[PDB]
C-alpha cells in the first residue's frame, strides 16, 4: 500500500497526455492580437508609511482596503482619494486583507495566526473587531469572504479552513498540501476554490464536500499567486520561476506558460481582466506586466513603482486596476 | 465644486491623515529588534530577564528609549516566505547555548547553520547582529570534564573556559561573509537585572549612530 501511488500517478499522467490533442497557442494563432495597451496612473493614494502587502476591492468597485505594517487598514475612496476609515490593528504584522461582498465586514491577518473580522457598519460609529478567529498553527496567508458569515482562510500549517463567523469555529479543515499555502481564490459561483502552496502544486477544493477534487503541477518553485478566470473554468498561477501558468479544471492540463527570457524575478500577484483577455501579474522588478491570456505575448508594462509590486487587483466592473507596492503607495490605472 | 457632504468627507480624511502622521511619528521613535535562536537556546530566559502560537511582542524602555522585540521562534513554518517582513529591524538578537556542544538535535552545528542562513540573508545585509552566549556557567561546569573536540574536530588548544569560549565566538563570527557592511556584537549572558539591557542599549545606540554617519557620508 506504499508502491501503487506512483503507478496511479503514471496512469493520471497518461490520461492527461491523451487529452492533449492540441495546444492553446495553435488554436488561437488566428485571433486579432490585442495590441499595445497603454495605461496611465489616474490616482496615487498616499498615507501609508510602511510596506503595503495586501489590498482588495469592494463589490461596489469604488471602495478598497489596503494593509500595511503600520498596523492600520485604510478604506480608500478611489473616486476622490478620500480616506473613509482607519482601523488600528492589534498586531502590526499583517500579510493579508479582504473586503466582504456586502461591504459590511473587513478581514485581515498575518504572522499572528488570529484572523480578525472588523465590522464597519457599527451604530456607535467606530470600527471594532467582530471576532478573532484562531486555530491555525502557522502564520495566516490569505483570506477571502464567501458571505457575511463564512470565510475561507489559508495558513502555513499546510491546511485551509472554512470558518463559520457566527459560532467562531472551523466548519471544515482542508488538508493535503505538502507545503505552506501561499494564496487563495474563490470561484465566481463560490462552490469551489483553488489554493496554491510552496509544494509547487495547485489543488482544487470543494467547499461543501471538504476534500481535494484535483491537483495541478508544472511549476518548479513556490506558487505565490493564483486567480480564477471570471468564467470559473480556468485559473492562473504565479511562481518565483517568473512563469505564469494557465490551468483548466475540466481539461486537467496546463495550457500556456507566460514567461520571457529577460524576466528572472519572482511573481507576487496575479489578476485577470473582466473579459479575461488581459492577464495582469505583479512582478518583483519594480513594475507589473500585462499578458494576453490567449496569445501569451506581452501587451504592456505598468511601471510606476519603486520598491516592489506586492499586491494587484481589478475592479469587479473592470474599469480600473489597483496596484500596491512596498513604496507605501497605491496607484490606480 | 465639492458639496457640503464632500467637504465634510475631505475634512474627515485630513483628520485621519493627521492621526496617521502622529502615530507614525510615535512609531519611528521606538527601536525594533528581532529575537532568534534554537528551541532550547534560552530565548525565554533572556526575554524574561530583560523585561523590567505566533509572533510575541515584548515592550520595555531603558534610559528613555523604547524597545520592542519580535519572537519568531513559535512559527514552525518556512522562514523565507515571511523573514522579509523584518527588513527594517534595527538589529537582530541571536541566542546560542554554549552547553549544546555535546547534545544531539550536533545542535551547535544546527545553530551555526541558522546563523549562516540569517546573517548572510539578502534581506539583512545592512542590519547588525547582537549575539548572546547563554548558559556560560553550565559551560564552565561541563567543559572541564568533556573536551570541546567532541564537536569541533579541528580544535587546537586546552580545555579551559577562557580560550574554549574564545574559539566558539571566533567560529561564530568567522561565518560572517559581509564583515565590511555588518558587525557582530558578541556577549556572554550572565545572570543579572541590568547588564544585559545595558549591553543591548549600548549596541543599539552605537549601531544607529553608525547608520546615521553612513547616511551623512562621513562613514
Amino acid at each position, epitope marked *: 500500500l506504499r508502491q501503487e501511488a506512483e503507478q496511479l500517478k503514471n496512469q493520471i499522467r497518461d490520461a492527461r497526455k491523451a487529452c492533449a490533442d492540441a495546444t492553446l497557442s495553435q488554436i488561437t494563432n488566428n485571433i486579432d492580437p490585442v495590441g499595445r495597451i497603454q495605461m496611465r496612473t489616474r490616482r496615487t493614494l498616499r498615507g501609508h508609511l510602511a510596506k503595503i502587502y495586501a489590498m482588495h476591492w469592494g463589490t461596489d468597485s*469604488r*471602495l478598497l482596503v489596503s494593509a500595511s505594517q503600520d498596523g492600520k487598514l485604510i478604506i480608500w*475612496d478611489s473616486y476622490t482619494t*478620500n480616506k*473613509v*476609515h482607519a482601523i488600528p490593528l492589534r498586531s502590526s504584522w499583517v500579510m493579508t486583507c479582504a473586503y466582504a461582498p456586502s*461591504g459590511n465586514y473587513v478581514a485581515c491577518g498575518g504572522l499572528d495566526n488570529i484572523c480578525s473580522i472588523y465590522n464597519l*457598519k457599527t*451604530r*456607535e*460609529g*467606530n470600527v471594532r473587531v467582530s471576532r478573532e478567529l484562531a486555530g491555525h498553527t502557522g502564520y495566516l496567508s490569505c483570506c477571502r469572504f464567501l458571505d457575511d458569515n463564512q470565510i475561507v482562510t489559508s495558513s502555513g500549517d499546510t491546511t485551509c479552513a472554512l470558518w463559520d463567523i457566527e459560532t467562531g469555529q472551523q466548519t471544515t479543515t482542508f488538508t493535503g498540501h505538502t507545503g505552506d499555502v501561499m494564496s487563495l481564490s474563490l470561484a465566481p459561483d463560490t462552490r469551489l476554490f483553488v489554493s496554491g502552496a510552496c509544494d509547487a502544486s495547485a489543488k482544487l477544493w470543494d467547499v461543501r464536500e471538504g476534500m481535494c477534487r484535483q491537483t495541478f503541477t508544472g511549476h518548479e518553485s513556490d506558487i505565490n499567486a493564483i486567480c480564477f478566470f471570471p468564467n470559473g473554468n480556468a485559473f492562473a498561477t504565479g511562481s518565483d520561476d517568473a512563469t505564469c501558468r494557465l490551468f483548466d479544471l475540466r481539461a486537467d492540463q496546463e495550457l500556456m506558460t507566460y514567461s520571457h527570457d529577460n524576466i528572472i524575478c519572482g511573481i507576487t500577484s496575479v489578476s485577470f481582466s473582466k473579459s479575461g483577455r488581459l492577464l495582469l501579474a505583479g512582478y518583483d522588478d519594480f513594475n507589473c506586466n500585462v499578458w494576453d491570456a490567449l496569445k501569451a505575448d506581452r501587451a504592456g508594462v505598468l511601471a510606476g513603482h519603486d520598491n516592489r509590486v506586492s499586491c494587484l487587483g481589478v475592479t469587479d466592473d473592470g474599469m480600473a486596476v489597483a496596484t500596491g507596492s512596498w513604496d507605501s503607495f497605491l496607484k490606480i490605472w | 465644486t465639492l*458639496s*457640503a*457632504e*464632500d*467637504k*465634510a*468627507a475631505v*475634512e*474627515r480624511s485630513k*483628520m485621519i491623515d493627521r492621526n496617521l502622521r502622529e502615530d507614525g511619528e510615535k512609531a519611528a521613535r521606538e527601536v525594533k529588534l528581532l529575537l532568534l535562536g534554537a528551541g532550547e537556546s534560552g530565548k525565554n530566559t533572556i526575554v524574561k530577564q530583560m523585561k523590567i502560537t505566533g509572533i510575541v511582542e515584548t515592550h520595555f524602555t531603558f534610559k528613555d528609549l523604547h524597545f520592542k522585540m519580535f519572537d519568531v521562534g513559535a512559527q514552525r513554518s518556512e522562514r523565507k516566505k515571511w523573514i522579509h517582513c523584518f527588513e527594517g529591524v534595527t538589529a537582530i538578537i541571536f541566542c546560542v547555548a554554549l552547553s549544546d556542544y555535546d547534545l544531539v538535535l550536533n545542535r551547535m552545528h544546527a545553530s551555526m547553520k541558522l546563523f549562516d542562513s540569517i546573517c548572510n540573508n539578502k534581506w539583512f545585509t545592512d542590519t547588525s547582529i547582537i549575539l548572546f552566549l547563554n548558559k556560560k556557567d553550565l559551560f564552565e561546569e561541563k567543559i572541564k570534564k568533556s573536551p570541546l573536540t567532541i564537536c569541533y574536530p579541528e580544535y587546537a588548544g586546552s580545555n579551559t573556559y577562557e580560550e574554549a569560549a574564545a574559539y566558539i565566538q571566533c567560529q561564530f563570527e568567522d561565518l560572517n561573509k559581509r564583515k565590511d557592511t555588518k558587525e557582530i556584537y558578541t556577549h556572554f549572558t550572565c545572570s543579572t537585572d541590568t547588564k544585559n539591557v545595558q549591553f543591548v542599549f549600548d549596541a543599539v545606540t552605537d549601531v544607529i549612530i553608525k547608520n546615521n554617519l553612513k547616511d551623512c557620508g562621513l562613514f
Partner: single-chain antibody, 230 residues
Framework: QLVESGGGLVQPGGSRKLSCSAS????????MHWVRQAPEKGLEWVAY????????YYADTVKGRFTISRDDPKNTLFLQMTSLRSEDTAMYYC??????????????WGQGTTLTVSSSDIVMTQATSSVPVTPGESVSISCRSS???????????LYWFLQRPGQSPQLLIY???NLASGVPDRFSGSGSGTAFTLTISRLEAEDVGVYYC?????????FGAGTKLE
C-alpha cells in the same frame, strides 16, 4: 444616546447656557447640529460644528447671537445664547451626524430641551399640510424645492424625517433612495430633480405624525413645513 439640559424661563435680552451629554458612541468622530422647533411650527436649523471644531456654521437668523462649541474629553456639546428675543422661544434638539461615503447623517435625534422667553436659502414647500389616512392604506407624500438638489456627482441631497406625537424626529430616508437603519421596508422614496415624493405601504400604528423634508446641498439647511397624517 443624547440628552439636553439648561432650559427654562429666561427674560428677554439675557443669556442662557445650553449643554448636552453624549454617551454610548465615539462623540469625537461625530459632527453635531442644533435644530429648534417653535411651539406651533416646523423645524429650523440653528448651528453646526464639525468634528474637531474644524468648521462652524450658523443660520442667518442667529448669526453672531449664538455660539456653538465642543469639548471632546467630557463628550459634551455646548451652545451659548446671548441677547434673547421673543422669536427664540422654541424647544431645541441635538442632532448627530457623520460624513463619509455611505454614511447616514442626521440619524439620531436627542430628547430635546425647552427654552421659553417671556413675551438665498433653498425654499422647500409641502402644500399637502394634512392628509386623513386609514390603517392598511397606502399613502404618498410629495415635496418640492427651488434649486435642484441633484448634484453633478449623482447624489440627490434630500432627507426625510418623521416626528411622532411627543417624540423626537427619526431619520426615515436619506439621499432620496436609502432607508435608514431600522426603518421597516414599507417606506420608499423616489423622484427626479426639483420634485420628490415619499410612499408608505400599508400604513399602520405609530405612523401618524409630521413628515419633514430636508435639503443638504449647501448651507443653510432648510426644513419643510411638514405633512401631518391623521
Amino acid at each position: 444616546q443624547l440628552v439636553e439640559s439648561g432650559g427654562g424661563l429666561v427674560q428677554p435680552g439675557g443669556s442662557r447656557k445650553l449643554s448636552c451629554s453624549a454617551s454610548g458612541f465615539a462623540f469625537s468622530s461625530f459632527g453635531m447640529h442644533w435644530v429648534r422647533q417653535a411651539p406651533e411650527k416646523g423645524l429650523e436649523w440653528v448651528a453646526y460644528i464639525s468634528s474637531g471644531s474644524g468648521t462652524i456654521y450658523y443660520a442667518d437668523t442667529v448669526k453672531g447671537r449664538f455660539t456653538i462649541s465642543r469639548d471632546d474629553p467630557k463628550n459634551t456639546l455646548f451652545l451659548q445664547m446671548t441677547s434673547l428675543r421673543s422669536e427664540d422661544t422654541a424647544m431645541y434638539y441635538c442632532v448627530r451626524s457623520i460624513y463619509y461615503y455611505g454614511s447616514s447623517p442626521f440619524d439620531f435625534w436627542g430628547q430635546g430641551t425647552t427654552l421659553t422667553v417671556s413675551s438665498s436659502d433653498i425654499v422647500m414647500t409641502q402644500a399637502t399640510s394634512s392628509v386623513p389616512v386609514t390603517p392598511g392604506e397606502s399613502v404618498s407624500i410629495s415635496c418640492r424645492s427651488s434649486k435642484s438638489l441633484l448634484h453633478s456627482n449623482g447624489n440627490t441631497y434630500l432627507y426625510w424625517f418623521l416626528q411622532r406625537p411627543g417624540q423626537s424626529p427619526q431619520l426615515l430616508i436619506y439621499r432620496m433612495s436609502n432607508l435608514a437603519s431600522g426603518v421597516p421596508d414599507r417606506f420608499s422614496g423616489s423622484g427626479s430633480g426639483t420634485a420628490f415624493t415619499l410612499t408608505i405601504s400599508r400604513l399602520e400604528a405609530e405612523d401618524v405624525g409630521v413628515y419633514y423634508c430636508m435639503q443638504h446641498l449647501e448651507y443653510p439647511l432648510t426644513f419643510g413645513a411638514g405633512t401631518k397624517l391623521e
